[PDB]
Design a binder for this molecule. Structure first.
Ligand code: A1AK5
Length: 167
């Protein structure tokens, strides 16, 4: 958990302009959060990047989990191996508002982080999931009580988020 160069927003929420894959390699976190979908198909974006960094071992494990347990629910999660990126990967499904899912499920999605003491995570439901990233950060700060290090891989969005928080 050797997080470096983060800006502390509250006593338990930190943020950095960084690629979550590169952070996972530098930090060696106990838990890395994946921005998953309910069938754990890591086809692109954050999930595709984390799977590629494991040389597809995350996707094979994920397929075996789904075969035995069935899909997750939106707002839900599961704990699988972190492979070379962390001790564990917490796969969390935030709502995809571009696909009609309820933005209220973003609170349930962040609540899964409270089962782990320290996590490296992306900003849930942002990017092509369509939620307003300023709102996602607000839900994170209000919901997460354990220690969360957010990696946001876009300096333009990072600056807007820090300027929204410090208003
Ligand atoms: C350029 N080579 C591919 C690639 C991409 C990455 C890569 C992207 C990325 C990231 N993006 C942010 C984000 C946050 C959440 C969601 C998405 C996107 S999404 O994938 O569109 C849908 C699920 C939710 C974005 C708002 C700046 N944040 C952190 N670390 C990241 N790493 C490495 O390699």
């Amino acid at each position: 958990n050797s997080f470096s160069g983060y800006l502390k927003l509250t006593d338990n929420v930190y943020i950095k302009n960084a690629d979550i894959v590169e952070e996972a390699k530098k930090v060696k976190p106990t838990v890395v959060v994946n921005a998953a979908n309910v069938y754990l198909k890591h086809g692109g974006g954050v999930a595709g990047a984390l799977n590629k960094a494991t040389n597809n071992a995350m996707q094979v494990e994920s397929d075996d989990y789904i075969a035995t347990n069935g899909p997750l629910k939106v707002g839900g999660s599961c704990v699988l191996s972190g492979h070379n990126l962390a001790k564990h990967c917490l796969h969390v499904v935030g709502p995809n508002v571009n696909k009609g899912e309820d933005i209220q499920l973003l609170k349930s999605a962040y609540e899964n982080f409270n089962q782990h003491e320290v996590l490296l995570a992306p900003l849930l439901s942002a990017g092509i999931f369509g939620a307003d990233p300023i709102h996602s950060l607000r839900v994170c700060v209000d919901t997460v009580r354990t220690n969360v290090y957010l990696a946001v891989f876009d300096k333009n969005l990072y600056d807007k988020l820090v300027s929204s928080f410090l208003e």
